[PDB]
Amino acid sequence: SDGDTAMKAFNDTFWDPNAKMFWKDSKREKHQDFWVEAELWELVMDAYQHTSDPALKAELKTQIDDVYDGTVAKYGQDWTNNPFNDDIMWWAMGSARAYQITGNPRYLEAARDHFDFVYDTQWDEEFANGGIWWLNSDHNTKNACINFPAAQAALYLYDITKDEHYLNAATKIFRWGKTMLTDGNGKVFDRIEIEHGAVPDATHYNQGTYIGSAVGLYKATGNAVYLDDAVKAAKFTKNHLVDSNGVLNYEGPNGDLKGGKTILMRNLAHLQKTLDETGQYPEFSAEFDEWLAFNIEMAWSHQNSDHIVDGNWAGQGTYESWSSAAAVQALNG
Ligand SMILES: OC[C@H]1O[C@H](OC[C@H]2CNC[C@@H](O)[C@@H]2O)[C@@H](O)[C@@H](O)[C@@H]1O
């Protein structure tokens, strides 16, 4: 019931049924940024999968379609005019998931066409021995926030199509990213910049997409090293991207990072599910489950009277949909 209450409250506060988009904040003066809207789309899908209330489930299923329609009305169906390859890939990944839920052809086309544009034209072997460029305008940096989401999108497309092309892509992208965008012990680097090298700044959302791609690769390949990869990145997050009480950091003031716990929590749930299913890493699993539950309880203890939780989970006017999404995500694992 907590997940249902949280999602209903989030919609009541932030969903605009007229534009079929989320508001960026509770002043209701501007709709959410394009890339973040794909992440709120996935939140709707996660609540759809989590709920056991058939009436709410049907409403959320409809909302999956309405989110796409509202975005396409403002931004079009062809996102390849957007210079941000990551923006495109977040929508390609969301579209693959929407296809799995709904069966509507438009979503498979959207996923496959946009994945192909990025992977087939924005992969480069010369700089840094591999990796996808951040932008399709200028080619100066290759980033975790495009590469790991691309591996995830490829894994969804493999699951849908069974075409080994997509598994091969996920494997190649992840191998490059593990080698060039991590320290080999679970710390995920932000990016590798031409003429400079690695920028080893770690953030919640890049830990998340690394973990999710690793768990997906473990499941698709049967290679246990990928599960180990995921566990090491989860451990790094729990020990090194938290405050002194173990509560996940607040990553403001940057607007893109403020809500990153949303993406982290989505992917930590994948890891929790796989550990529960396989019985692997039982010691870590117990520690991890306790730490997750603690974070969730602390976050929700700061909910306001409308059942909205700001993204500064360690503490207590205007609430923002991206920063507030993480607490909702956490109850819809
Ligand atoms: O420092 C945060 C963030 O900044 C830049 O990306 C911003 C967004 C652009 N497109 C949508 C999201 O994927 C990004 O967060 C990049 O420098 C990025 O690597 C970095 O984490």
From TrEMBL:
Coiled coil: none
Transmembrane annotation, as ranges: none
Molecular functions per Gene Ontology: carbohydrate binding
Gene Ontology biological-process entries: carbohydrate metabolic process
The UniProt record lists the keyword Signal: yes
Keyword set, alphabetical order: Signal
Name of the protein: Alpha-1,6-mannanase
Organism: Niallia circulans (Bacillus circulans)
Organism taxonomic ancestry: Bacteria, Bacillati, Bacillota, Bacilli, Bacillales
